[PDB]
């Protein structure tokens, strides 16, 4: 007792409930209101060209079949109740490998309001592909997208919308930022349509604008390259008669420029095109090699 009334309410709700059918299957279109809270913007992987993001993924929709009358206006139920009812089959269009967290128990919540409205939040770590053009590397900025929508329900059946104003519908926790070599300038949301052979689907888009931090690349490539160039330069002040000295300087500097070139190329992915750092390295290499040619002519 003291909960038999609630047990009866829940048992009545599920009784004669078909969770294979979306709410309002024939009468109307199921309107799912979506919201994202980013508890942490994970590190960006350039080699894999992906970023990790940990979020509270909130979805809300109205289910007439779940209307109830009871002492409580909102039923805060366990996650396991969510499997017995219809929930949207949202998927991430550009998601590579996403994990639904389950410690200690599935990180999901289901809340039912007496009017039939449902709130369904889950905790996720989404790994989404973020295509990048690295022609300006390491002084480059990217808008990493997070597209999501419904699998198996077209615009005519399930549509997605932001719970609140689109500008305020994707919220990033102030302290949640696991970026090391990037800066999160802001996020932008959009809504559109995906044209598919199976139909037309609603896609909700979010773009996170990142600008790469250059301090590490400065310290590891540009300052060493400038220092190698100057080390090659100082040979001119050296004595002409010290031919072995100047030869050692030149050859060692050229070897040093090759090792910096090869070590700098491995950091970024094996893209075909040439990045800004590549041009800087090439020009520094040319300068040191010209110093060697000048010593040879002398």
């Amino acid at each position, epitope marked *: 007792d003291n909960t038999t009334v609630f047990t009866r309410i829940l048992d009545r709700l599920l009784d004669g409930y078909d969770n294979r059918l979306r709410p309002g299957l024939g009468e109307r279109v199921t309107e799912v209101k979506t919201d994202i809270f980013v508890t942490s913007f994970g590190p960006v992987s350039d080699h894999d060209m992906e970023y990790t993001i940990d979020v509270f993924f909130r979805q809300s929709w*109205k289910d007439e079949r779940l209307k109830f009358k009871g002492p409580m206006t909102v039923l805060r139920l366990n996650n396991l109740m969510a499997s017995k009812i219809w929930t949207p089959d949202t998927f991430f269009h550009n998601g590579k490998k996403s994990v639904a967290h389950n410690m200690t128990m599935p990180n999901k919540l289901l809340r039912i309001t007496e*009017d039939g*409205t449902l709130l369904y939040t889950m905790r996720l770590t989404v790994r989404a592909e973020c295509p990048m053009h690295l022609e300006d590397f390491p002084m480059d900025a990217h808008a990493c997208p997070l597209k999501f929508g419904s699998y198996a329900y077209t615009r005519a059946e399930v*549509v997605y*919308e*932001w719970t*609140r*104003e*689109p*500008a*305020r519908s994707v919220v990033v926790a102030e302290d949640g930022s696991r970026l090391n070599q990037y800066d999160l300038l802001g996020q*932008t*949301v*959009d*809504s*559109g349509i995906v044209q598919s052979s199976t139909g037309e689907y609603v896609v909700m*888009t979010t773009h996170f604008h990142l600008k790469r931090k250059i301090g590490y690349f400065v310290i590891q490539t540009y300052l060493p390259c400038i220092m190698t160039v100057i080390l090659s330069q100082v040979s001119f002040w050296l004595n002409r008669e010290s031919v072995p000295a100047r030869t050692v300087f030149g050859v060692t500097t050229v070897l040093t420029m090759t090792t910096l070139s090869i070590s700098a190329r491995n950091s970024l992915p094996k893209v075909a095109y040439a990045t800004a750092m590549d041009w800087f390295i090439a020009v520094c290499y040319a300068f040191v090699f010209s110093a060697l040619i000048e010593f040879a002519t002398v």
Partner: antibody
Amino acid sequence: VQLQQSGAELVKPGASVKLSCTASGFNIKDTYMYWVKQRPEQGLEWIGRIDPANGDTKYDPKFQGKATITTDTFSNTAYLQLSSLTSEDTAVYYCARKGLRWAMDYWGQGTSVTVST
Amino acid sequence: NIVMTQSPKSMSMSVGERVTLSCKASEYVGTYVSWYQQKPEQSPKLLIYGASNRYTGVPDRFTGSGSATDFTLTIGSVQAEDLADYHCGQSYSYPTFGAGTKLELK
């Protein structure tokens, strides 16, 4: 499907006025309710919005205190009340409903709120 | 506060030919720009929701487009019923409307 907004009201300057927007054919709890004023032969300007299910209200930064949006879910009605009325408040006030892509799909007939002696 | 600059402020273009209304936004408002029609002494009527979507029961001569900040509304052929004030509004953030442009025939 239709918002039966109240009638035109004549208000002496400095006197508060209550404007009601009655919704039918839908539950205001479902969507947001908006209030928009249009000056005579001028562009629309958003006043504020209410989320009746939650009860939260946001305002155009220029309307803090000068306006107050409230709802009555039981009455399925939205109310706009202006604290103080001046010569600048003699406009037409509209009630609108949030739509598909956050568009104001349904608008009320409007209320003429003239401030004069 | 996104400011929607709507131009031209007025038009007297001849009936039967193309009409182009261009609405520009101060900031990014992805596709949440809507076009409302306001016939004289009457409440506005929604024409375009989102960018390039028509509302139910709207003449097919109306069509919009726009991506980030440049949005336009096009009428294939004007009619006597199209003599009305048109306003562009954004809903990406707290709503703001444009100045509205009047359409006239002559």
